[PDB]
Each structure stands twice: as C-alpha cells, then as structure tokens.
Design a protein around this nucleic acid. Structure first.
Ligand SMILES: C[NH+](C)c1cc(NC(=O)CNC(C)(C)C)c(O)c2c1C[C@H]1C[C@H]3[C@H]([NH+](C)C)C(O)=C(C(N)=O)C(=O)[C@@]3(O)C(O)=C1C2=O
Ligand SMILES: C[NH+](C)c1cc(NC(=O)CNC(C)(C)C)c(O)c2c1C[C@H]1C[C@H]3[C@H]([NH+](C)C)C(O)=C(C(N)=O)C(=O)[C@@]3(O)C(O)=C1C2=O
Ligand SMILES: [Mg+2]
Ligand SMILES: [Mg+2]
Lengths: 169, 294, 35, 209, 159
RNA sequence: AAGCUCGUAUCAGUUUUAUGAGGUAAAGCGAAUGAUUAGAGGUUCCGGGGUCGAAAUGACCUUGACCUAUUCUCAAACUUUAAAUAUGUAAGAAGUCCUUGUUACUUAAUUGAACGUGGACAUUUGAAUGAAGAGCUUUUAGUGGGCCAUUUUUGGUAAGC
RNA sequence: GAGAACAGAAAUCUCCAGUAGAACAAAAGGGUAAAAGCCCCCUUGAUUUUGAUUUUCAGUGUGAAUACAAACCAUGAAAGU
RNA sequence: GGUUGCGGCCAUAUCUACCAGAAAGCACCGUUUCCCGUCCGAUCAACUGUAGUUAAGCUGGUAAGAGCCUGACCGAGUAGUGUAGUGGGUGACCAUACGCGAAACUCAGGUGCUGCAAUCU
C-alpha cells in the first residue's frame, strides 16, 4: 500500500556554468550566496576544449546543494517563475527532474548592479524514505523494485501536488 | 530494465568475502589487528570489539582461532538496567558503564581482580594502567572499532575510557576524548567528568524543561514516568558504577520456554524446500497451464 | 571574507584527452536552428 | 616474384598472425567465403559434400581463391546459381615471410597469407539437393585439381551444414523443436526458462501436426 | 639485449589464480610455524615484500628461524657438482605447511598405537608398509553374468 | 697421485606411497583480449540518403551503426581448463610420548619457545632394490677450436647452412 | 544510459548500471577496490651502528633487494606500518 | 530452529524477476543542546526508544532461470605424450608394442555448511 513510502525531496542543486574564470564566476558565486543562504562550491574543468575556450584545471562552474524546507521554497519559487508547466522530458526516467531559468531577477533579490545576470539550472532528486540503506557506510545495499521512484510515480506526485500540468508525451 | 548482466560477466565475476559482501567487516583492518608476532607462537591477540546498534551497545573480548573467533567476555547495554540505568541505554554514560563492566568481568574471570582495582575515584583524568611491580602485568587488549568513524567525542572511545578505568591496559591517546581542545592541546577534566557522569543529558533536560514542555515531554516520557529528577543523573550513574564494582558476574535470564520448545514451535513458519518430483510436477503443471499458442 | 572551496573530482584520468563520446562525426544535423 | 607453394608447403614455423607485433602485412586474395544461395535453409539443402585434407600442410590464400572461383564457375554454369551453397572452412591467418649481406639480419618482411590445414580438416563444404551430387562432386574435383596435396571428397550424411544426421534431423523437425533462422536453425533445449521457451517454440508446446 | 632480472620469466608464475585475486586469508595468517617444521614455498603475487626468487617456487625446506613477520627456510639447491644450503627470509603468505609432514605424523602416531596393542596382546607387530602385492586366487560367478562377445567395428567415417 | 678417519645405522643419474609446484602439447572462442565469415530479429530515439501533402523537433522506407541470440576459422609475445616426460620434500633412534629443570626471550599467567635430566618404545628402528665400501683433505697435469645421430626447436626457399 | 538555461557530439550538475574494461612518473609483464587508485591532515624510515641472506655468482666484487637486532623518530585511537 | 555481535572456508554463498516473515533482534525512523563534521545534521557526530513502519535493508522460498560446484564406464581410452623397432611412406606424416592420459561436449544432482557468546513464543 502506502504506509511511509510516499515520496520526499532529497536535495535541490543550483548550477551555474559561466564558462570562464574571474569576475563573472565570483559574481555567480555571490548570486548563489544571496539566493540559497549557503556557501557555494566552485566546480573545475576536466579537459581542454578549443571551441569552448576552456582549459583543464580551470574553474568553470559553481553549484549549491540545498535540502529540506529551503529546498522546497526554492523549488516553489522556481516553479512559480516557470508558471507550473514542465515539459515531460524534464522528468528523467529515474524520476528525478529539473528545469532551467534565465534572468534570475524573476525570483527573489533585486538586481544588485555590481553582480550581473545569471541563469541557473534547477535539478531536484526525490527518494522514498529509506535511501540511507544505499548511502550509509556499514552494511550497504540496494533499494528494492517497489522503490527507486519512476517517471510515472514522479509525474503522478507532481500532478497531485503543486496544481501543475505537463506537455504532449 | 534491460540491464541484466551477461553470462560471461557472471562467470568472470569474483565474489568478495562473505562479511565484505554483507558489509560488516574491514579485512584490511582485521588482518592488521589479528596477525600475531610469529615469535610468540600461541598468544592470542585480544580485541575489545565495540559495536553500536540503534538500541544496544555490544562490547566483547574476542580472540582469533583458525576454527573461528571465540569470546572470552561479553557485556550488553540491555543488561545494564539490571545494575542501575533503566533509561538512556545508548548514551555516553552507557558506553562508559559497558566498558567498566566488560573490564571488571574479564578481570574477575581471569582472577586478576584482587589487584588492578582501577580508579574507584572516577574524575575524568587521562591515565594508563601502570603495571604493578613484582606481580602480573595488566591484561592487554586492543580496541576494535570496526567501521565507525574515529571522530572526537565517540561512544566507542567512551567505552575505551571505561575499560582503561576498569583496569584493562588499552593503549590509547588522549586526543580523541571529548574536551580535547586542539587549540590548547590538553584535556578538560571537568568536561570529561561531566561526559562520564552524563552531564550533557542533564543540561539538555534543564534546557528543554525551561523552554519547551512538549519536546521535553515527548523525548523524556520514561524519565517523568520514573519521576527521575534532572539532577539525579549523577547519583544514579555513580550508584551504577559501584554496583558494577560490586558484582561484575553474568546472570543469565530466566530462559523460559526452553531450547527444544523454541526450536519446535517458535520457528515452524520457515517454508520448506521441495524435491525433484515436486519440482517436475510444478513444471508439468505449468506446461499444461501454458499449453496452446495463446 | 569570500571563502573559496574546490570540488574534489572523483576521476583518475590525468591525460588531456577528450573521451571517445566526443567524436565530431557523431552530430545531429537538422538540429532546430534559431530563427 | 611469386615463389612456389613447394617452398611454402609444409608447416615449419609457429603460427605467425597479424597482431600488434606484426603490422604492415598485405591483405589476402580471398575476400568472399560463402557462394551460391547463402540465404537458403537447411530444409532446402539436405545433402552435404566435404572436400577434406589428408596431409598436414599450408594452403595459400590465393590457392583458396583460385579453387573457389573454378568451383563456383563450374557449378553456376552447369546447375545454376541457386542450386548449391559453398562455404570455405579455412581462413588464411598465418603470415608467410620472404627474405629478399648474407644471412646477417635474415628475418624477413611479410610476403603473403596462408591457412594451416590439418589431417582430417574440411577445406570446402557444399550443401545441395539430392539430385546435384554429380555436379557437386565434379566441382570439388576441379578444386582438388587446383589445391596441392591429396584430398578426399566425402559424402557428409548430415542434414545441411549443421550436425545431427538425416534420421535425427527428421525426428527433430517433425517433433517441432527446430526453428528456421536465417541460413541456420535454432534448437529447443530442456534447460532454458519455460516462458521464453514457450514464446520461442509454440509448435512443440502445442498439439499441432 | 639479454636480461636476467629478479622476476624475469615470472609472468604466469606470479599471476594469481582465476577468481582468486584480492586479499589473502587469515587462515594463512594464523597458522603457526615453529623451528624444525617443514614448509612448501609457493609465492603469493599480491604481497610484493618478502617474495622469493623464481627458483624457489614450489620448493620444500626446513624452517630454521622464526621472526616478527617472516620465517627463515633452508633450501638445498644444485649448482655445479654440489648442493648448497640457502637461507631464505620469506613471509608467511609465501610459506605454507607440508601435508606429507602431517600425514607422516599421523602415521607415526598410528604406528605407536599399533605397537602398543601388539605388545599388550603379545603378537608380532607387522609395522612397516608393504607395496602392492600382485593378486590372489579368485572365483568369478557366471550366474547372472554370461560373457558378452565383442567384435571390432568396421570403418564408418563420421564426417 | 699421496693419502687420512672409519670400515658402526651411510648413500643412490632408480622405483613405490604421501604431498607439492609448473602453464608446454592439447583444447577453447554460443568464456575475457585480439583477429574473423555469414545470414536472422529489434532500436515509433532520423547517424546518412530519400519518398509522402516546399512543411513537420510527423509517418512509409533503404542503408549504416548498435544490441540480442546464432554461425565459420584462428592466435610465440591470448586464455577458463589442462596433460605425458622431466622436478622439490618426507618414509623416525639426530624419532615419538610422559612428568619436570634453565632463561635477561615471550605471555595476563607455572603460559609458550629453545635446549635439557629421568622413564617407555627387540625373532619387521617403522616402502622397494643395490652397495665390487663410506666420508674428507691436499697437490698437480692436460683441456678451455669440437663434431655427428634420435626427439623438441630458432633464423633461412633450402643446405654436408 | 536517462535528464537539467545558454549548452550542441563534447563545458557543469545529479541518479542508475558499472570485477576494474581506469589509475599507479616512464617500456612490457605481474599486483591492487571500504586499495597499491583519487582528495585531505601530519610528517621526513630518502636517519645512525655494523652484521646475516637472496639474484647474477667462482657462491668474488658492483648494483638491487629481503628479514631482523640496538637506537632515535614519524604516523595513527590502536593493532601495526 | 530464528536474530544479533565476532568470525572460518570465500558464489553449493553471486546475479535477475516475484512472493512470505507470528516473537525478539536488526533496520528504517524523530531532534540539533553538546563533542564533531561537512557547500549541505544526506554520510558523519550527539540525544531519545519516545511519534510510527515492516515499504525497503536483512532472512527464507519459487524460477524446465543465468552463473557456480560435484559426479559419470557421456565424449574418450579420443587428442596428446614417454620408450622401441634395419616398421611403413619420395616426403609430409602414420601405424604398431610397452606405459600414462586430457579439455570442450552430453547427462544427472545440488544452490551454503559451520565455531564462540548473547537473546527470542
Ligand atoms: C649390526 N652391527 C654389526 C652394526 C652395524 C652397523 N652398520 C650397518 O648397518 C652396516 N653399514 C652399511 C649399511 C653396510 C653401510 C652399525 O652402524 C652398528 C652396528 C652395531 C651397533 C651396536 C650398538 C650397541 N648397542 C646400543 C645395542 C652397542 O653395544 C654399542 C655400544 N654401547 O658400545 C655400539 O657400539 C652400538 O651403539 C653401535 O654403534 C652399533 C652400530 O652403529
Ligand atoms: C634404522 N635402524 C637401521 C637404525 C638406525 C640408526 N640410526 C639412524 O636412525 C640414522 N642415523 C642418524 C641419526 C640419521 C644420523 C641407529 O642408530 C640404530 C638403528 C637400529 C637399532 C636397533 C636397536 C635394537 N633395539 C630395539 C634395542 C636392538 O635390538 C639392538 C640390540 N640391543 O641388539 C640394537 O642393536 C639397536 O640398539 C641398535 O643398535 C640400533 C641403532 O642404534
Ligand atoms: Mg655406532
Ligand atoms: Mg644406539
């Protein structure tokens, strides 16, 4: 049935890939500080691409992991600026979903003329309660087949909550 | 999900050891703990194995044999309420009491109890059990934590200090007990005495009873049921310490509904395997059920 | 102060080589071009 | 150029194939290994005829291609192109070497490719109908004219190329445990899963004729 | 051009067994060797420290020294016109016991037992082993077993 | 060659019994790596070329690619398996068992380790067969161009190479 | 593999599968998965005194390595290394 | 007979799909004051056993299951190999005599056993 396996939000990840180093990346980190209320972590390149203008071991992106009530309020603000419609793709086959916003002034803080415009990627993952069995150290395991939330379960939950709608497929 | 692994993969697959596969032991650590200096030839290396479940603390003295590890002494936090501690069976004071209990139990069993009295004036100071001159050396065991983190302020180190105060020569340093401020690089005797005598639970009780009645009530229902006041934790923990110093001998339970009754009736719901003719009968029944091109 | 923190990559390759999934022959022509 | 197969005839060296240690070798002369109606079924072609070796030797890749052409040309000219399936059962993997002052530094460059053939090893296999025995035997006689050594034309009494001599293949087919694949067959075993055995062979698990 | 290193020609010699890679086990760590024991040398590839030379692989010797993590084994090796004694310092993962030696101990215990009874009842001992005596006189019953006649088969080619 | 100490339980270009070790011949590729012939089915996921109403972030396809189950042939520098022949050790008296002596080693310890005292172990002292002796030492010569035959094998087309 | 603004074949982030198909400075072989790989903390056993042993071997040297002993250290909660 | 802690052998134990688990235990689980640790009380640390749950973990069963293990007079005394011949054959190579002797294939069976200590209708 459904005693306690209903669903829950595990974490929300805010990702900004500025593609260069310096003032732009630092200002993106300040945007993440002011939005999440939490120190952002700067992600680093993997290999050089000539067309991308990136170099190996050069700081490229920045991301924040948030959990709990702050995760749900950030998700609510993101869905509010995304007018509660999400394109079905937008719900990956392992149930985790996400979207992307441009011109982050649409939610929250004013422009702060010294930082700039930074679009960001919202990515959210969900789990049924009991993912500690595959995350903990001693006596690891894998969740069973009446678990590991699917696309249909996620879209059913996302149509039950939030009063949202989906697209064609 | 079309990720079924191939027969070649399953044939070349080397399974790990049983305990590594069930994720209970670290064999690197086990090797280094139980390999003996070969010039002693028979002396077992004795492990103070400390484990923590969600509701119990298991503290054992284990030696290693080719046929399998054997137990010299055992002490359980669900046996602690016989002494003095009816609540908080997995706290720091329970860990210290279990270490004291296992140390006194193994010394009573080995007949090393008249000497090596330990402390009896528990003060939260760091000392090693010095060997008594012209007498037997102290019993040497090595702490087996297992897989848990060796962070500062760990109940396994609470049990370590319990054994060290009980009289077992555990080799250890003081940079893992609570109150070890690395800025000052010494120990805090007052804070460590508070942690031994359960001071953090006491300050927690007075803070909750001052601020939130519903959270204090919800977490401490059994405390209010026994009417145990917020300032009697040190009284009951001390009285438990001298009860441990009095009688560290294992009293088994009443053992009602004996072993053969347990085997005969308490476990009969295990579903029995079939044999060859029954398996062939199920195969033929499925052939009859799936007969036809439907 | 602006505390700086780095992502510790769980990768072992130290060669400066793109993966074989980066073949430029593999490319979706007739991708929707912006109007 | 073109040294004799009499100086490359016997198996004298270890097998020396194309590997990471032996590069820049020339490609073999034989590229096609199946001729005739290669999409036909074992139900279509019952009789097997084998050209088999009787000496331990080395057949040249180009000897294989020359005998393959003369055989296929004769069979196609006499009995048509769809009356037979010819499969060559040896592949040239042994790189043969040529030396080309004195014996100092005598290790040579790669020269050609050859297939090492053992005693009792099938070189050519032809499956056909029962009426075409004479034309298949004559075509393989031309093939044994062009190969070196002594060879034998044997009438293989297996249904087609596979296995399971003609009474056994009959009993399997009218039992129904044989399924027609492209140019071969699949067999029902009593060791698989029941579900996929049902949905792969319904005729055995029905009361059909 | 030519090389004789410490581990030349030791590819398949120091490979592990199939589906036997990884950690070596605590039985081989907890077995005890005392001075005078007879041990067999087969190198384990996982532990690189203390490994023997390739000459001593699969070789039997007497342990003479027992120390912290290794044992010393005396091996006779043939060079020239003489055997030389060699004193190897090998670790306990490369050292294993000798089942010929344990069976010899069980046989000496059995022999001591057998002589103890044979002295108690006053009968001759018959202690040393005898090799396979040929056979004895026997009777075979045709009842239920009539000899079936076999003949050589003709030549039928299977291919 | 000169011998010397013993001719007192010592050995063997040998076999058995017990126990090891190896990765060569074979074999294998519907088992990993590499090579490789041929069809069958599938990918409503357009990789490439089309067609259908110039349309299609649409269908009907061809064709690759990929996957699944098969199929033919291999590998000195591939391998799960794995010989035969050669190869290590042992077959007690310098051995086994029982009580108790030393130690600064070791142990929580009158526990262990090593070496011991004392006592028990005969018409089989603990497989076979042989011994025209066993062991040891000194001194010194000549030699330090080799060649052929059976089998295994390298380079070479091959060679009385 | 499935997804997420710009972002596409490939920039960053997740989840799942993943017996090692990666990495271990270099040639090849062997070995290694709660590590011998990748990040972090502390360090200088890359130290002193000479002996014994293995490999090539005449059982000489050189080089390399192995196991100890007497010290003094490093690290770790500790066994240990 | 279960369950826990520590294990021995290290797939007869693994993998895939689906069912069952009364008691206890284990687990999931609740909170952030302290010790502590992170970008993040997710892991880790600490406190309670209370608010609940067997949904997962775990255990066991089923599958003409994949794999793995054992055996066979199944293949096969076959391939291969020592030793011998003034044996054969132009040779390649083959046969015989005295010995040893596989692997794949086929078929059948099986799908963890066990040591110490504690606890359980
Ligand atoms: C049968 N005898 C002639 C003999 C033979 C051998 N050696 C052999 O077997 C022959 N050697 C070959 C095998 C041919 C190389 C022998 O080796 C011996 C002996 C005799 C023993 C006698 C022993 C004896 N005690 C203990 C029974 C004895 O009285 C003394 C003594 N206390 O003085 C001994 O000398 C004695 O112990 C001894 O030494 C003998 C032999 O060694
Ligand atoms: C194996 N047999 C041949 C043997 C071997 C040795 N020596 C060895 O074991 C080998 N020597 C080493 C220690 C390895 C250097 C031996 O030393 C002996 C013996 C034989 C015995 C027989 C003894 C015997 N016992 C029962 C008293 C006996 O009857 C007499 C006697 N009183 O007449 C003996 O002669 C006897 O005592 C004896 O001399 C033997 C040995 O010494
Ligand atoms: Mg004598
Ligand atoms: Mg004597």
């Amino acid at each position: 049935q459904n005693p306690m396996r209903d669903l829950k939000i595990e974490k929300l990840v805010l990702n900004i890939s500025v593609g260069e180093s310096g003032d732009r990346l630092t200002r993106a980190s300040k945007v993440l500080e002011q939005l999440s209320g939490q120190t952002p972590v700067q992600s680093k390149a993997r290999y050089t691409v000539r067309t991308f203008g990136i170099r190996r071991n050069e700081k490229i992106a920045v991301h924040v992991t948030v959990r709990g009530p702050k995760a749900e309020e950030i998700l609510e603000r993101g869905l509010k600026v995304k007018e509660y419609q999400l394109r079905d793709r937008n719900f990956s086959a392992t149930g985790n979903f996400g979207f992307g916003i441009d011109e982050h002034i649409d939610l929250g803080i004013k422009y702060d003329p010294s930082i700039g415009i930074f679009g960001m990627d919202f990515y959210v993952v969900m789990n049924r309660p009991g993912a500690r069995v595959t995350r903990r150290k001693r006596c690891k395991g894998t969740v069973g087949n009446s678990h590991k939330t699917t696309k249909e379960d996620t879209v059913s939950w996302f149509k039950q909550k939030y009063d949202a709608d989906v697209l064609d497929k | 999900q079309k990720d079924a692994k191939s027969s070649a993969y399953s044939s070349r697959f080397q399974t790990p050891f049983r305990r590594r596969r069930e994720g209970k032991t670290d064999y690197y650590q086990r090797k280094r703990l139980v390999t003996q200096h070969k010039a002693k030839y028979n002396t077992p290396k004795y492990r103070l194995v400390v484990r923590f479940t969600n509701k119990d603390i298991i503290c054992q003295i284990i030696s290693s044999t080719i046929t399998g590890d054997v137990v010299l002494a055992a002490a359980y936090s669900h046996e602690l309420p016989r002494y003095g501690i009816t609540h908080g069976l997995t706290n720091w004071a329970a860990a210290y009491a279990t270490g004291l209990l296992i140390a006194r139990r193994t010394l009573q069993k080995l007949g090393l109890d008249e000497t090596y009295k330990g402390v009896e004036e528990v003060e939260g100071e760091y000392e090693l059990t010095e060997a008594v001159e012209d007498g037997p050396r102290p019993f040497k065991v090595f702490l087996d934590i297992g897989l848990q983190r060796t962070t500062t302020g760990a109940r396994v180190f609470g049990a370590l200090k319990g054994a060290s105060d009980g009289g077992l020569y555990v080799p250890h340093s003081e940079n893992r007990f609570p109150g070890w401020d690395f800025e000052t690089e010494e120990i805090d005797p007052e804070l460590l005495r508070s942690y031994i005598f359960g001071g953090h639970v006491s300050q927690y009780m007075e803070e909750l009873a001052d601020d939130d009645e519903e959270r204090f009530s919800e977490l401490f229902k059994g405390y209010l049921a026994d009417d145990i006041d917020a300032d009697s934790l040190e009284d009951i923990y001390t009285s438990a310490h001298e009860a441990i110093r009095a009688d560290p001998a294992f009293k088994p339970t009443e053992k009602k509904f004996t072993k053969e009754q347990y085997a005969a009736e308490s476990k009969k719901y295990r579903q029995t395997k079939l044999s060859k003719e029954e398996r062939a009968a199920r195969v033929a029944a499925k052939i009859a059920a799936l007969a036809g091109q439907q | 102060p602006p505390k700086e923190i780095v992502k510790s990559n769980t990768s072992s390759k130290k060669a400066d080589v793109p993966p074989p999934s980066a073949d430029p022959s593999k490319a979706r022509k007739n991708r929707p071009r912006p109007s | 150029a073109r040294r004799p197969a009499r100086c490359y005839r016997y198996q004298k060296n270890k097998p020396y194939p194309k590997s990471r240690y032996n590069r820049a070798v020339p490609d073999s002369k034989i590229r096609i290994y199946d001729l005739g109606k290669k999409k036909a079924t074992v139900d279509e072609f019952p009789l097997c005829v084998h050209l088999v070796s009787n000496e331990l030797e080395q057949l040249s890749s180009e000897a294989l291609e020359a005998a393959r052409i003369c055989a296929n040309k004769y069979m196609t000219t006499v009995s048509g192109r769809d009356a037979f399936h010819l499969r060559v059962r040896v592949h040239p993997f042994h790189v043969l070497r040529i030396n080309k002052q004195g014996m100092r530094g005598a290790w040579g460059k790669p020269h050609g490719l050859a297939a090492r053939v053992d005693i009792g090893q099938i070189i050519f296999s032809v499956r056909t109908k029962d009426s075409n025995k004479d034309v298949v035997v004559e075509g393989l006689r031309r093939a044994r004219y062009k190969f070196p050594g002594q060879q034998k034309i044997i009438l293989s009494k297996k249904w087609g190329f596979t296995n399971l001599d003609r009474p056994e293949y009959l009993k399997k087919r009218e039992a129904g445990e044989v399924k027609d694949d492209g140019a071969f067959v699949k067999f029902l075993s009593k060791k698989g899963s029941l579900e996929n055995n049902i949905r792969e062979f319904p005729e055995y698990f029905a009361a059909q004729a | 051009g030519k090389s004789h290193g410490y581990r030349s020609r030791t590819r398949y010699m120091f490979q592990r067994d199939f589906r036997k890679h990884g950690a070596v086990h605590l039985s081989t760590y907890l077995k005890v060797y005392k001075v005078g024991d007879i041990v067999d040398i087969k190198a384990n590839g996982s532990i690189q420290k203390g490994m023997p030379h390739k000459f001593y692989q699969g070789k039997t010797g007497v342990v003479y020294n027992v120390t912290k993590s290794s044992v010393g084994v005396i091996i006779n090796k043939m060079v020239g016109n003489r055997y030389l004694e060699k004193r190897l310092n090998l670790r306990v993962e490369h050292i294993k016991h000798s089942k010929c030696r344990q069976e010899f101990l069980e046989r000496v215990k059995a022999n001591a037992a057998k002589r103890a009874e044979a002295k108690a009842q006053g009968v001759a001992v018959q202690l040393k082993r005898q090799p396979a005596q040929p056979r004895e006189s026997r009777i075979v019953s045709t009842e239920g077993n009539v000899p079936q006649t076999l003949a050589p088969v003709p030549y039928e080619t299977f291919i």
